[PDB]
């Protein structure tokens, strides 16, 4: 009923651009670590028996 | 960014609260020692005993505490020899001062301390006696015919009549030493008369002429600001202390030692100190007020009666050549009711051509003895503000002259002078007689209900001096916990079961003399009338005003006079008092409050560059002479014309009973009223008139028929004359005409620019016709010009305004401000504040002024004991809510930041501060003791007419609709009769209930606010035009800039008065006892949805019903606004000046909400009052009902 | 500096505004109890007036 209209200004957008640089960055991580984990995993642990 | 800074101006505006209550405290603490203890109001218990002599009330809220006020224990007087004691009084001069009355004991140290510094007062010469005034005594009899003068019959008291061997002006009282002639024998027809001069000159004229009521102790105002550094406290402490000259108060009277007038001297100097103080003089003004106040405390008040002469046509003429341009304003639509004024440009150089008569000789003249005065200073100044520029310093300085005449106050003539004084052509009457014929019949016309038998009674209820009135006898008798033991004495106050508690008993025997009273309970006297009445002798009244003007004198009619011209002439009165859009300015109700409107058609005249219209001012004095004779006659004549519309009738007069007389034997004794002689008495002065009479509802419209007259046969005569002798002719465009006073604008019909030869031929009126010195009093008397005017007090100069200076609070006539309650004090020094800010005083001043009066104010006195309130108090609801910065703005207070907690407890301590408890109980023992007191023709006449069932229909029947429906009248009527007794005895019994209310912790619930909304601001632009006030302060100048200038077209009106006009309108439709303000009260209990049933338990035929539905409907809003507040003695001059009405709202208020009309006009009040104060400061805003940023993140609009 | 966001979130968390509470309470106000007994028995008190307009 009272729907606003979404006004954008600059400090809006300088807030988003350094979010989308955290947001790269925290990628990038998860990437690494999920590559280490796999190669842990594959390195260590050998298959399972009943 | 505007919010933010109003919130920071309301938080200034709590700082500079604050700081006043504090300073308010810290002051009082000098004149009673410091506070010796903290009382609680609820936590700590007292027994009224024990308590120090001044404690402080504080009152305990939610963990906090707030400063009720201070109290006075007068039984622990010890504490104040601390502070005063005559042990500390040595000096010689001031121990006789002690004990002429110790009031001074506290002043007396103080002077000490001066007379310690070293610095001693030398004594000042006291003028004697001069011989000739015992050959002005005059002492008529039947011998002598009363000195052949007419008027005068059965005389029994001396006159001061001039005489060859006789001082000048014999009347005016001179300051006196008291060592003069005991017994002095006077030659009367015997020669053996012997008169106690001394004794009668001492008491009588000490207090006739010469009253000093000051609205405080002056004892307390002398210590407060009488520092005797300044120089003019220690030239009257020259003339006090020096030479022994005493005086002093006693009850409402005062008491004289060695010097009469001594008491006008202390007048004089306060009126100095608290004149220069506010008008902010420059040196200049300084010097010459110094000059004055040296030259004129010889005598306080016969110097200025000496100058009125040479001052009042030295000031006729400020500003009448002033090269400066000025204001400028449009001439468009100037014969209509609908003028207004508004800026046009105008071209430079106009001053040449504009022309102002001067009378130079006279000028001169009064220069000459204005030298010989000594007033050289005085004299040099209004003659170069003659020739000036204009300037508010310059005006200021223009004005100085009555400045300097409002010095001594209340001052008048002997009575029995005064009375003597004041007592004593065919075209003419004919066009007077055809001015009379013609309002009669317009007035007969427009409300004819007086002609009819049946509305006679109500017209005579709605509606004195009567020979015959009731008394009431009884004892009113009242608990007090509030004396003491002593005290206790078996004619008074008498000591009861309760070891406390005593029971105090007053005896009262009083008169019921008041017109309503009168009414109810005696009504034969105003209703038969016999031909005899026209004989009896009537009371005068005497009434004082402020500066030295003829004392004026009110001559009442009787009561079967006064009801024929309330059937009779008061239509007439009325239909001229009316006056409303759309009408010619040369009209009826048009020939004949707010000065810029007023003086509007004046105001652009004077700004213009068209020369072709020029102003007329005439005064007309003494004129009561020319009243007696062919001119009373011919108003009788025009009264009598309507009888031929009226059938039945007699010949002659007979005596007659008014509700089954004919109209045209009312008409016909109104008639005899008007033309014969009638006889009036006071003071055993006895004196008979054939004039104006000065009879009420009656004087207006005989004296501007009078001038209407004047001025069509002048107008007439200098027309014919300019035909005689070639010269361009005149023609009258608009005229206002207000009692003896009239400004007329008349343009030239070719349109050549106004000439001197012009001038002169119309001053000189009736010319060949009349003596020279009818030529001579009429060139003294009028004004004619283009550049400055006047008219009741009313100075306009260029487009610019000025008013008068006589009007100040510290003494007044009658004492009465020693009479009324606190809340009603505070409200008529708020009052005269106000009214003084709109002209020559600023915020500073005024706000000084207003709280040095706060801060010497009595306090609440019962008993022996005695109550301070908080100066706080005027934020609180109940008194005007006011910020200090704007004080304009009533009911402001609310939105201020004060706590929340600190609010409650201040708005419960005003309620508490007034009661009604004591004057039901006063009526009740009254009508217990005295029984009925109403006759039984208003008990028979109002009875119940609408037939309808007094249960209603079953709804819930109010106190106050009990109170005012028919069955139920008789007891409320006698109500009436017993509210209008007054006596000290209900203020006394009054003062002891608040005194234990408030210590016993008992605080009245304050009622709650009728509207309150916060108004967020934004900018915007300008509305208003600038100021013609150019004395006015800033503030109110901006806020005319801003939002503009009201006029009385526009104005809003009281719903009371709407609906006592259709109350009024409609007589026989609702009982007459009914007013406004009771309907208004009783609908404002009721819900609206059954407001008609209500309308019909009132017993309101329709067309007065439905109109007061209608109004009820539409303007509730200013009634519950006003519903918790007196506004009797509240004129908002400044307030009323800004134009808030419906054309400024929509510039100034967004409201989106589906509101009712009352409810939204309350709300946009609401709002104006923040535009107000946003545009004291010369911001333009615009309030909304919603913030622009409710969220960091969110933003708001509409 | 808590208050006066308290006082301006007032404002949204409602759709009414004093001035509109003010109107909605000079109906309802007062009329339960002026009339009779009987049209009493056939109209809403007060409490239900208010909780059916707010």
Not at chain 2, 536 to 557: E, H
Not at chain 2, 1115 to 1131: E, R
Not at chain 3, 6 to 21: A, G, M, Q, R, V
């Amino acid at each position: 009923f009272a729907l606003a209209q979404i006004n954008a200004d600059d400090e809006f957008i300088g807030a988003i651009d350094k979010e989308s640089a955290e947001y790269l960055d925290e990628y990038a991580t998860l990437a690494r670590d999920i590559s280490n984990s796999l190669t842990l995993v594959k390195a260590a642990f050998g298959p399972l028996e009943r | 960014d505007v919010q933010e800074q109003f919130e920071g101006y309301l938080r200034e505006e709590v700082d500079l609260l604050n700081k006043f209550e504090d300073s308010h405290f810290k002051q009082l603490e000098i004149f009673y020692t410091k506070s010796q203890t903290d009382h609680v109001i609820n936590k700590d218990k007292l027994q009224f005993n024990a308590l120090p002599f001044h404690t402080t009330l504080y009152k305990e809220i939610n963990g906090k505490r707030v400063r009720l006020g201070t109290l006075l224990n007068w039984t622990k007087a010890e504490r104040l020899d601390t502070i005063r004691h005559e042990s500390m009084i040595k000096d010689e001069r001031l121990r006789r001062l002690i004990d002429f009355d110790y009031g001074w004991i506290d002043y007396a140290v103080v002077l000490q301390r001066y007379l310690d510094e070293g610095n001693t007062i030398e004594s000042a010469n006291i003028l004697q006696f001069d011989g000739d005034f015992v050959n002005n005594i005059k002492h008529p009899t039947q011998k002598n015919n009363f000195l052949d003068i007419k008027v005068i019959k059965e005389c029994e008291t001396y006159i001061l009549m001039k005489d060859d061997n006789g001082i000048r002006d014999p009347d005016i009282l001179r300051a006196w030493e008291l060592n003069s002639i005991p017994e002095v024998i006077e030659l009367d027809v015997d020669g053996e008369t012997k008169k106690f001069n001394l004794r009668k000159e001492m008491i009588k004229r000490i207090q006739d002429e010469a009253p000093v009521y000051f609205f405080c102790n002056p004892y307390r105002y002398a210590v407060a600001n009488l520092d005797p550094n300044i120089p003019e406290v220690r030239l009257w402490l020259e003339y006090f202390i020096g030479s022994e000259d005493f005086f002093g108060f006693n009850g409402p009277n005062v008491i004289v030692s060695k010097s009469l007038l001594a008491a006008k001297r202390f007048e004089v100097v306060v009126n100095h100190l608290r004149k220069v103080a506010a008008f902010e003089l420059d040196v200049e003004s300084k010097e010459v007020m110094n000059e004055w106040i040296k030259y004129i405390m010889i005598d306080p008040v016969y110097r200025s009666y000496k100058n009125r002469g040479a001052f009042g046509n030295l000031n006729q003429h400020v500003f009448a050549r002033t090269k400066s341009e000025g204001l400028s304003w449009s001439l468009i639509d100037i014969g209509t009711t609908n003028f207004e004024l508004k800026p046009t440009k105008k071209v430079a150089g106009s001053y040449v051509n504009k022309f102002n008569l001067v009378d130079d000789v006279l000028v001169e003249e009064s220069l000459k003895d204005l030298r010989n005065e000594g007033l050289h200073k005085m004299a040099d100044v209004t003659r170069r503000m003659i020739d000036a520029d204009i300037t508010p310093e310059n005006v200021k300085k223009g004005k100085l002259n009555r400045l300097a005449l409002s010095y001594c106050g209340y001052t008048g003539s002997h009575s029995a002078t005064a009375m003597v004084k004041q007592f004593n052509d065919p075209m003419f009457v004919d066009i007077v007689k055809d001015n009379m014929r013609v309002y009669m019949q317009e007035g007969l016309q427009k409300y004819p209900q007086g002609s009819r038998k049946s509305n006679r009674l109500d017209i005579l209820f709605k509606g004195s001096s009567t020979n015959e009135h009731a008394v009431v006898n009884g004892r009113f008798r009242y608990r007090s916990e509030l004396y003491r033991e002593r005290d206790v004495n078996s004619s008074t106050v008498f000591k009861t079961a309760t070891p406390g508690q005593y029971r105090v008993v007053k005896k009262i025997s009083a008169k019921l003399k008041s017109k309503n009273a009168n009414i109810v309970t005696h009504p034969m006297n105003f209703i038969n009338f016999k031909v005899d009445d026209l004989d009896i002798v009537v009371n005068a009244g005497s009434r004082l005003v402020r500066g030295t003007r003829a004392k004026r004198i009110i001559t009442p009619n009787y009561g079967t006079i006064y009801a024929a011209s309330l059937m009779t002439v008061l239509p007439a009165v009325r239909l001229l008092s009316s006056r409303a859009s759309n009408m010619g300015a040369l009209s009826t109700q048009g020939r004949i409050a707010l000065p810029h409107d007023v003086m509007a058609p004046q105001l652009a005249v004077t700004s213009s560059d068209d020369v072709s219209k020029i102003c007329v001012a005439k005064d007309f004095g003494q004129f009561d002479t020319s009243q007696w004779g062919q001119i009373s006659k011919a108003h009788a004549d025009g009264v009598r014309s309507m009888k031929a519309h009226y059938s039945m009738g007699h010949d002659t007069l007979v005596d007659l009973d008014l509700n089954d007389a004919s109209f045209a034997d009312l008409l016909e004794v109104t008639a005899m009223s008007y033309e014969r002689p009638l006889k009036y008495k006071m003071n055993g002065l006895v004196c008979e008139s054939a004039g104006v009479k000065s009879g009420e509802l009656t004087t207006q419209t005989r004296n501007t028929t009078t001038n209407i007259s004047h001025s069509t046969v002048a107008l007439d005569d200098y027309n014919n004359r300019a035909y005689r002798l070639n010269l361009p002719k005149l023609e009258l465009v608009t005229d206002n005409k207000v009692g003896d006073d009239s400004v007329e604008v008349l343009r030239v019909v070719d349109g050549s620019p106004l000439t001197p030869e012009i001038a002169k031929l119309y001053v000189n009126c009736m010319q060949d016709h009349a003596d020279k010195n009818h030529l001579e009093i009429s060139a003294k008397r009028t004004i004619v010009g283009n550049n400055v005017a006047e008219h009741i007090k009313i100075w306009v100069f260029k487009g610019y305004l000025a008013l008068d200076v006589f009007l100040d609070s510290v003494t007044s006539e009658k004492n009465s401000f020693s009479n009324l309650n606190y809340l009603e004090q505070v409200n008529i020094l708020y009052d005269m504040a106000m009214t003084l800010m709109i002209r020559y005083c600023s915020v500073q001043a005024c706000m000084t002024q207003f709280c040095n009066d706060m801060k010497l104010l009595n306090g609440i006195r019962a008993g022996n004991y005695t109550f301070i309130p908080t100066p706080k108090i005027i934020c609180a609801y109940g008194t005007p809510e006011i910020c200090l910065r704007a004080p304009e703005i009533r009911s402001f207070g609310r939105y201020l930041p004060i706590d929340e907690d600190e609010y409650s407890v201040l708005n419960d301590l005003v309620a508490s501060l007034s009661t009604n408890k004591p004057k039901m109980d006063f009526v009740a023992q009254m009508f217990e003791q005295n029984g009925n007191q109403v006759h039984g023709i208003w008990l028979d006449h109002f009875k119940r007419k609408n037939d309808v069932n007094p249960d209603g229909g079953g709804i819930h029947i109010s106190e106050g609709l009990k109170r005012l429906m028919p069955e139920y009248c008789e007891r409320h009527l006698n109500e009436l009769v017993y509210k209008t007794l007054d006596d000290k005895v209900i203020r006394d019994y009054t003062s002891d209930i608040i005194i234990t209310n408030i210590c016993k912790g008992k605080l009245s619930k304050a009622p709650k606010l009728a509207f309150f909304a916060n108004f967020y601001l934004s900018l915007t632009g300008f509305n208003g035009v600038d100021s013609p006030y150019l004395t006015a302060d800033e503030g109110v100048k901006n806020v005319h800039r801003v939002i503009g200038l009201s006029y009385r077209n526009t104005l809003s009106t009281s719903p009371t008065a709407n609906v006592d006009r259709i109350l009024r309108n409609n007589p026989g439709s609702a009982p007459a006892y009914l007013t406004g303000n009771d309907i208004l009260g009783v609908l404002s209990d009721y819900p609206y949805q059954n407001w008609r049933t209500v309308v019909e338990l009132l017993d309101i035929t329709e067309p007065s019903a439905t109109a007061i539905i209608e109004v009820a409907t539409n303007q509730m809003h200013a009634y519950l606004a006003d519903k918790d507040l007196n506004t009797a003695n509240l004129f908002d001059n400044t307030s009323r000046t800004y134009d808030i009405s419906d054309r400024t709202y929509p510039k100034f208020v967004n409201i989106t909400s589906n509101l009712s009309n009352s409810n939204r006009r309350g709300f946009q009040l609401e709002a104006m009052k923040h535009i107000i104060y946003m545009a004291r400061r010369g911001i333009a805003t615009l309030a909304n009902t919603h913030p622009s940023k409710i969220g960091n993140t969110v933003y708001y609009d509409y | 500096e808590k208050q006066k966001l308290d006082k301006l979130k007032l404002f949204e968390t409602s759709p009414f505004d004093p001035l509109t509470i003010k109107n909605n309470q000079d109906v309802v106000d007062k009329l339960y109890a002026t009339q009779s007994s009987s049209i009493q028995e056939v109209v809403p008190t007060k409490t239900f007036a208010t909780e059916l307009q707010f």
